[model samples]
Target: MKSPEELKGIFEKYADKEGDGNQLSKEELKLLLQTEFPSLLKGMSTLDELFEELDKNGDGEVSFEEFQVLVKKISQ
Candidate 1:
């Protein structure tokens, strides 16, 4: 279990930080990764790359739908 059931609260907390009240902008992602997933920032690729990876719609924002994938990606 990658904790999908418990992700709603954490997802909304950062996603609501700015823009659309639910989407996660680059800034919001930065805040999230730096705080919760610091290892991601220090990994093989840059945050920009990670951003594009999780941003499935390519709308420059990461929706909860796509955010869930990222958590799974990291979980394993």
Candidate 2:
């Protein structure tokens, strides 16, 4: 498991790639997962499904708070 600081750094790195450094666009999410956790999606559903699930508020983008859910899932 990674430390909280490390996870925050990872989130910032990808989240800042485009608009609004506070959140992640679907494209950013894809790049982050592919680069940092290549096997994370091996048997999971498509990126669209993953994005929709993570967007909780239906905001079209994912905030870091929402991203915490993914962090927890990966940690397990």
Candidate 3:
């Protein structure tokens, strides 16, 4: 299990890849999961579905708060 700070660091690292540094796009999410949590997607839903769920307001982007939903899910 990762500590809260560790997760936040990872999130910021990837979230800043492009666009606003405060949010993550679907593509950024994909790269983050694939690189940081390699096996996370193995039998899980497609990236589209994951992104849709994580986007919360359907804003086409995911903020850190929204991204926490994923961290919670992954922890479970």
Candidate 4:
């Protein structure tokens, strides 16, 4: 089992250190979902669909705030 600090370290290693609004590819996003929280990964299916919606700029990538909003909703 991972301690909270260990988990945080993983996120730091994986997630964007520069913060949000950057381009995140589907592979990177999937890696985060699979590794960071396997239990939560199922919700990611719909999330894949939702990401399309969040890519409002039509740039085919989601920003940090957009990803954060989805995470925040899941956390709630």
Q: What is the C-alpha local distance difference test score of each model?
A: 0.64, 0.67, 0.68, 0.48
TM-score of each: 0.65, 0.70, 0.70, 0.48
lDDT of 3 by residue, 15-50 (tens): 788776678877787776676575665446677777
Candidate 1 lDDT over residue span 1-34, tens digit each? 2554435544677778765645776777767656
Which portions of model 1 show Cα errors greater than 4 Å?
4-6, 73-76
Candidate 1: the clashing residue pairs are none
Total clashing residue pairs per candidate?
A: 0, 0, 0, 2
Worst 10 residues of 1 by lDDT: 1-10
**How much is the lDDT of residue 20 in candidate 1?**
62
Question: C-alpha displacement of 64 in model 3, angstroms?
Answer: 1.2
Clashing pairs in model 4, backbone N/Cα/C closer than 3 A? 20-64, 21-64
Over 1-76, each residue of candidate 2 has an lDDT whose tens digit, in order, gives: 2454555655777788876667887777777657667557544677777776676665678887777766764444
For candidate 3, give the lDDT.
Answer: 0.68
Error of 2 at 24 (Å): 0.3
Error of 4 at 50 (Å): 3.6
Better of 1 and 3 by TM-score: 3
User: Cα lDDT of model 2 overall?
Assistant: 0.67
Mark the regions of model 4 whose C-alpha exceeds 4 Å error after superposition: 1-21, 43-47, 73-76
lDDT of 4 by residue, 1-73 (tens): 1343433343344445334314454544555546656455454556466567456663545555455544543
